[PDB]
Design a protein around this ligand. Structure first.
Ligand SMILES: [Mg+2]
Ligand SMILES: [Mg+2]
Ligand SMILES: [Mg+2]
Ligand SMILES: [Mg+2]
Ligand SMILES: [Mg+2]
Ligand SMILES: [Mg+2]
Ligand SMILES: [Mg+2]
Ligand SMILES: [Mg+2]
Ligand SMILES: [Mg+2]
Ligand SMILES: [Mg+2]
Ligand SMILES: [Mg+2]
Ligand SMILES: [Mg+2]
Ligand SMILES: [Mg+2]
Ligand SMILES: [Mg+2]
Ligand SMILES: [Mg+2]
Ligand SMILES: [Mg+2]
Ligand SMILES: [Zn+2]
Lengths: 139, 185, 174, 141, 37, 130, 142
RNA sequence: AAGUCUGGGCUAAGUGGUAAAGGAUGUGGCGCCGCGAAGACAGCCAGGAGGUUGGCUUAGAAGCAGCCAUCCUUUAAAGAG
């Protein structure tokens, strides 16, 4: 018999253990916490990994609801350069890379998100995700 | 680019007394003329901070005899760090040795590591005609690691515009950039 | 910018006599008196007061505001009137009005006897609210600050006498 | 800490601290100088104290140009010994600094950064100081 | 209350008053409270 | 110095790309619930001109240098001026009068309206929607 | 240690713990030795985490100085494990006396009495076996 | 003994009537650039938002321990702070 919610978190893809903060407010839920790894890692066994956010809400008779989003621009590029970790010291240190199209095919994956309906605007932010970790873009 | 400044002639007046009234002693000269002149401090400060010894300060002499001069040297009061007295070279037409600013166009590869671009010369020396005063002159610093040296012998050179100083002259380096990680030794 | 150069209303009906050095400011709630710099010029007009300064020298320019607001303050106080209410947080803590005087029961082996002065009115509505009110503005602000400092707030516990709606920030005990 | 790698004469006469600088009254390497306002003897360890505080402050980055060098031996007598009996023995080095002397010069550093480095450095020092930025006068020199 | 030759501002919330001869520093954070002495 | 040249070369360029603009007092919603009655003000029309949102007496004095009959229905209070003539308005101003009305405490009450080139009133621009 | 006065003072005295449960560890054991004058003291020897042990070590020696009654030489207190040193404590000696009767003041007579003392603040160090009687309720209790 | 002299400034510390690094909304005066009828500065009332934890790091660093680096749609604007 605990009140309703409006929860704001930021949980990863795959690593779904009851370990916090899937708890400190998600117990104010009686949260069906294993419903994540199933409903979420089913549609999102198509991306792979990465922090896909989640807005869960509890109600009167102790149950939840959510519709998650998409994995980082720091993930979809890490697989497309053979990279687990970035580069330790970006801007000068390049490990792997991505082409003008390999950056375009990524905006393709995260377009139902941001704000711009452009492929010219979206991939810039993706191209902005480039230097951010040190991965070079081939001219 | 080129400027204008309002020189007044001066005679036996006591330098220190001009100075007292915010005025700054000087004297303009060349092959032909050499005449005792003074100019206002603040006027000249503004003009000079802007003009330096690269461009052409034109002189509004007190008789419509306007003259095209270059600042050959400013003499500073060593102590309280103010200028004391200028020289004004009057330009003719035979080519004149003087100083043209340098444009280090680009960011080096040395920084883009941590380095420091040490600009040895912020200007160079060249005999050129007063027609062609290339008020900037650029350099390819962009391709520069640390331990990298640039010499005057590179350097584009406009029309045209002869290097006064011997080509082996060094003008640029990128240098190691301190480190607390050093030091402790 | 600027404050002495600012119209003082005289909402009917409120007198504003001028004698040497001091003004007077009369009204329904009462009557006053305000010390003024003899080198400050007072102006009663068509039912609107305003005052003027000889110069722009640091003294006058500052003497302006103070003489303005201090006269203005009197007005707005014989007019409506001034007051602060208070807030006895804390458990055991209580206060009942006794006679014309204010009794506090606040943590000490003796409850404590506050008898008001001329012009101060003590109103204890409920157990945990004290209302001090009157025409002398400063006197109020003052007196209300006696009451509070008969047990100022803690830093570890919402507990003690507080101003009418003044914040609480605390630091942790252990 | 700085001191002549070798010399000719072990000790030397004190002299006198008169005039303004004979040279180096203008910023001539970096973009920002610290300049000297009183005259005094600045001691090998002060220069160092001042250098360090700037390096520690820049932490990685910048260059530091130090334009006084300490080559004047500074002599002292042993404690509790009496007058005469000879000249003291060398105890360190100062450099002689006279108003308008550009002592340090930083480069490749943001104006905000420099003036907080050159400011601290000046606290290390025994004299009064003024921070300045390579004018244009200094290029005309 | 600190007391110093160098009173200064510690953060942006510190104000520098000057009462009764002395230069004080006041601030909602009491630790910063100073008196030049 | 230093506009009259800046943006005043923009305030009557995209406010006079036709003749059917309005004025709404847009501010009092959170930047997410304010990039929702505006970001979706491109789905009641074409292009991307919701409320032009800029300065009164830089619109109400851009309403003289464009001579748009002086948009005098309200230029006191908050000023955003619904560029409804750099879009496709009509009763698409209905697609912007149920939005900022049936959400929060009167989310974006309106001000002015120039009907083709005539002053469309205040009490008469509200139910030009329903 | 970490738990009780803390455990609650942390949670405001609510909350609780029970440890029954005895698993074991493959982790790190590091135990530091505490030395007074280099005369390693056994009783004060303590046992902690490698990071914590590193943290504790300052307190031990430093907490030491109030403890050790003075012996005629500069008196080492140090704390350490297996031959490298986590800590330092030094105890002042100073069994000064000697100059206390010179007044004329040849600089050199003043020195002569300290040339015999400099030999004495050495000789006594090499044969110095040093002790501390109780008060260990104090040093290395904490 | 002889001016409570004559005019123009400063000083409010009994400074003058016993000191330094350093600190300071003390009070003055000249010279020079700034934003201001796109209404500036000060209070207010709104907003201060996204890809995004920026990658490295780490036990947690999500603008905000510390190394690197510093991009775009919304737009009236909003720092990889
Ligand atoms: Mg000047
Ligand atoms: Mg010395
Ligand atoms: Mg000597
Ligand atoms: Mg000597
Ligand atoms: Mg001698
Ligand atoms: Mg100093
Ligand atoms: Mg020379
Ligand atoms: Mg300090
Ligand atoms: Mg404050
Ligand atoms: Mg004696
Ligand atoms: Mg007499
Ligand atoms: Mg008189
Ligand atoms: Mg006068
Ligand atoms: Mg006195
Ligand atoms: Mg005195
Ligand atoms: Mg001052
Ligand atoms: Zn503060």
């Amino acid at each position: 018999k605990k009140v309703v919610a409006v929860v704001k978190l930021q949980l990863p893809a795959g690593k779904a253990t009851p370990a916090p903060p899937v708890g400190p407010a998600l117990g104010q839920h009686g949260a069906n916490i294993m419903e994540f790894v199933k409903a979420f890692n089913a549609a999102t066994a198509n991306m792979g990994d990465a922090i896909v956010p989640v807005e869960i809400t509890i109600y009167a008779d102790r149950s939840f609801t959510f519709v998650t989003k998409t994995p980082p621009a720091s993930y979809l590029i890490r697989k497309a350069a053979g990279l687990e970790k970035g580069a330790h010291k970006p801007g000068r240190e390049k490990v792997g890379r991505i082409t003008w199209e390999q950056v375009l095919e990524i905006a393709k994956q995260k377009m139902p998100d941001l704000n711009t309906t452009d492929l010219e605007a979206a991939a810039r932010m993706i191209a902005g995700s480039a230097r951010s970790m040190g991965v070079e873009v081939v001219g | 680019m080129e400027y204008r400044l309002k020189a007044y002639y001066r005679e036996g007046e006591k330098p220190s007394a001009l100075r007292r009234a915010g005025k700054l002693p000087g004297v303009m000269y060349n092959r032909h003329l050499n005449r005792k002149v003074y100019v206002d401090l603040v006027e000249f400060d503004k003009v000079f901070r802007q003009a330096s010894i690269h461009h052409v300060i034109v002189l509004e002499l007190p008789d419509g005899q306007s003259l095209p001069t270059l600042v050959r040297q400013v003499n500073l009061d060593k102590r309280r760090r103010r200028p004391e007295h200028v020289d004004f070279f009057v330009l003719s037409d035979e080519p004149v040795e003087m100083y043209v600013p340098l444009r280090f166009v680009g960011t080096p590869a040395g920084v883009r590591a941590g380095g420091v671009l040490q600009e040895i010369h912020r200007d160079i020396l060249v005999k050129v005609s007063p027609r062609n005063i290339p008020e900037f002159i650029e350099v390819d610093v962009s391709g520069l690691e640390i331990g990298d040296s640039l010499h005057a012998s590179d350097l584009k050179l406009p029309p045209g515009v002869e290097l006064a100083v011997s080509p082996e002259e060094t003008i640029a380096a990128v240098v190691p950039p301190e480190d607390v990680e050093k030091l402790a030794e | 910018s600027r404050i002495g150069r600012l119209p003082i209303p005289v909402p009917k009906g409120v007198s504003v006599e001028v004698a040497p050095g001091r003004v007077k400011v009369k009204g329904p709630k009462g009557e006053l008196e305000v010390p003024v710099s003899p080198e400050m010029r007072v102006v009663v007009e068509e039912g609107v007061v305003r005052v003027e300064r000889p110069s722009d020298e640091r003294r006058h320019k500052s003497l302006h505001g103070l003489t303005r607001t201090l006269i203005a303050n009197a007005v707005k106080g014989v007019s409506e009137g001034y007051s602060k209410e208070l807030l006895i947080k804390g458990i055991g803590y209580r206060a009942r009005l006794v006679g014309r005087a204010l009794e506090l029961t606040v943590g000490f082996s003796h409850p404590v006897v506050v008898e008001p002065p001329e012009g101060i009115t003590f109103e204890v509505p409920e157990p945990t609210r004290v209302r001090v009110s009157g025409i002398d503005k400063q006197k109020v602000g003052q007196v209300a600050a006696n009451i509070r400092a008969i047990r100022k707030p803690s830093a570890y516990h919402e507990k003690g006498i507080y101003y009418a709606g003044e914040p609480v920030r605390l630091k942790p005990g252990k | 800490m700085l001191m002549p790698r070798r010399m000719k004469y072990r000790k030397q006469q004190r002299g006198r601290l008169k005039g303004a600088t004979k040279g180096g009254d203008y910023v001539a390497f970096g973009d920002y100088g610290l300049v000297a306002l009183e005259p005094a003897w600045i001691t090998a360890q002060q220069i160092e104290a001042a250098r360090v505080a700037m390096v520690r402050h820049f932490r990685r980055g910048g260059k530091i140009f130090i334009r006084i060098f300490p080559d004047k031996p500074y002599t002292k007598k042993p404690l509790e010994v009496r007058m005469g009996k000879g000249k003291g023995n060398v105890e360190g080095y100062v450099a002689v600094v006279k108003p308008g002397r550009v002592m340090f010069e930083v480069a490749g550093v943001t104006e905000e950064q420099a003036m907080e480095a050159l400011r601290i450095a000046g606290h290390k020092l025994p004299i009064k100081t003024k921070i300045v930025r390579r004018d244009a006068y200094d290029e005309a020199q | 209350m600190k007391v110093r030759a160098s009173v200064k501002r510690i953060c942006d919330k510190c104000k520098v008053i000057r009462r009764h001869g002395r230069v004080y520093v006041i601030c909602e954070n009491p630790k910063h409270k100073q008196r030049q002495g | 110095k230093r506009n009259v040249e800046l943006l005043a070369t923009l305030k009557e360029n995209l406010e006079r790309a036709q003749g059917s603009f309005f004025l709404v007092n847009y501010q009092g919603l959170p930047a997410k619930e304010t990039h929702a009655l505006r970001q979706a003000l491109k789905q009641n029309g074409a292009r991307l001109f919701v409320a032009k949102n800029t300065l009164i007496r830089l619109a109400l004095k851009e309403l003289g240098l464009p001579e748009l009959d002086g948009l005098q229905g309200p230029s006191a209070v908050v000023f955003y001026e619904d560029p409804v003539a750099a879009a496709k308005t009509l009763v698409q101003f209905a697609k912007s009068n149920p939005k900022g009305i049936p959400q929060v405490k009167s989310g974006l009450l309106q001000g002015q309206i120039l009907t083709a080139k005539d002053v469309e009133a205040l009490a008469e621009l509200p139910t030009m929607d329903e | 240690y970490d738990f009780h006065d803390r455990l609650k003072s942390v949670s405001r005295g609510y909350a609780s713990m029970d440890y029954e449960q005895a698993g074991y560890r493959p982790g790190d054991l590091v135990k530091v030795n505490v030395l007074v004058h280099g005369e390693v003291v056994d009783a004060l020897t303590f046992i902690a985490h490698r990071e914590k042990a590193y943290t504790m070590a300052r307190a031990i020696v430093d907490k030491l100085a109030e403890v050790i009654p003075r012996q005629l030489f500069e008196v080492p207190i140090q704390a350490a494990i297996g031959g490298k040193i986590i800590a330092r404590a030094t105890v002042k000696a100073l069994r000064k006396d000697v100059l206390a009767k010179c007044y004329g003041g040849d600089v050199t007579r003043k020195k002569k009495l300290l040339e015999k003392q400099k030999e004495g603040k050495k000789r006594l160090k090499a044969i110095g076996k040093v002790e501390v009687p109780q008060e260990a309720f104090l040093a290395v209790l904490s």
